Design an enzyme around this catalytic site. Structure first.
Site, mmCIF file in Angstrom:
data_model
loop_
_atom_site.group_PDB
_atom_site.id
_atom_site.type_symbol
_atom_site.label_atom_id
_atom_site.label_comp_id
_atom_site.label_asym_id
_atom_site.label_seq_id
_atom_site.Cartn_x
_atom_site.Cartn_y
_atom_site.Cartn_z
ATOM 1 N N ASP A 154 0.849 -1.195 0.000
ATOM 2 C CA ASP A 154 0.000 0.000 0.000
ATOM 3 C C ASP A 154 0.880 1.239 0.000
ATOM 4 O OD1 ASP A 154 -1.897 2.148 1.139
ATOM 5 O OD2 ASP A 154 -3.290 0.440 1.194
ATOM 6 N N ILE A 155 0.543 2.206 -0.847
ATOM 7 C CA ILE A 155 1.314 3.446 -0.896
ATOM 8 C C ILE A 155 1.130 4.339 0.343
ATOM 9 C CG2 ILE A 155 -0.370 4.824 -2.173
ATOM 10 C CD1 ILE A 155 2.000 5.909 -3.833
ATOM 11 N N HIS A 175 -10.592 -4.755 -2.768
ATOM 12 C CA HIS A 175 -9.232 -4.952 -2.291
ATOM 13 C C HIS A 175 -9.219 -5.443 -0.860
ATOM 14 C CE1 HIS A 175 -10.185 -0.648 -1.741
ATOM 15 N NE2 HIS A 175 -9.366 -0.655 -0.677
ATOM 16 N N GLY A 185 -15.409 3.293 4.558
ATOM 17 C CA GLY A 185 -14.208 4.054 4.230
ATOM 18 C C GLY A 185 -13.509 3.505 3.002
#
Ligand SMILES: Nc1nc2c(ncn2[C@@H]2O[C@H](COC(=O)NCCc3c[nH]c4ccccc34)[C@@H](O)[C@H]2O)c2nccn12
EC number: 3.9.1.-
Lengths: 115, 113
Positions: free
Chosen positions: B30-31, B99, B92
């Site tokens: 995850d970035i 994902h 959210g």
């Protein structure tokens, strides 16, 4: 006593009461006794698997079935604005019952990070 | 797969730190990590959100979880981890491509947001 003597194993065999939402041959959905959101339920396999880290490759469609049943139950319970699904593994994940289970939480804004 | 940033990642049009790939899913870091290890497992099929997953997609969803738990082991998460799927605004959900988040390397707390 098929399915073992965790609390969840006993719920499956109707030895300990629970508020059931949905049941089939593969799984059971029931409300959490300590809800962390306005709606908070669990989906568990009837097959006893202690934790996701030891699930077998052949357990894939069962794990998927937890999520499909989870999302259907969320829809039936009117969680129109959405929800969060959580599986915890081990100590750092926060597992207290060693029988695989999917948390489904909704009815409020969930925040980030997810704990 | 899809008109989201995750579609671009699957198509190798932008960079991501890929952990694992097969014919039907992709795992990558995850970035915006929320734990010392924080990665995603996504299907290559563009399912926008878990709420619209088809019955026929059951074993694909399960595959994401098996791949996640194998990646977690390969990345040294021997003390445990948390798996998360967000749906919709209350959930959210940040990208409308299904994902699975996998977070570990610290104590995860309760409630989970
Ligand atoms: N209906 C119903 N539900 C029950 C019963 N006994 C337990 N549960 C629920 O099972 C869940 C297990 O969650 C985890 O394994 N980790 C999440 C929570 C957690 C535990 N330790 C942590 C440590 C860190 C972070 C999170 C956690 C909890 O949310 C309990 O409230 C019960 N007896 C009769 C009916 N019953």
């Amino acid at each position: 006593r098929p399915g073992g003597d965790t609390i969840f194993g006993k719920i499956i065999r109707k030895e300990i009461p629970a508020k059931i939402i949905f049941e089939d041959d593969r799984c059971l959905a029931f409300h959490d006794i300590s809800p962390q959101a306005p709606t908070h339920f669990l989906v568990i396999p009837k097959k006893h698997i202690s934790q996701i880290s030891v699930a077998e490759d052949d357990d894939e469609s069962l794990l998927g079935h937890l999520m499909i049943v989870g999302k259907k139950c969320a829809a039936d319970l009117g969680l129109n604005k959405g929800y969060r699904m959580v599986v915890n593994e081990g100590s750092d994940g926060g597992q207290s019952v060693y029988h695989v289970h999917l948390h489904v939480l909704g009815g409020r804004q969930m925040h980030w990070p997810p704990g």
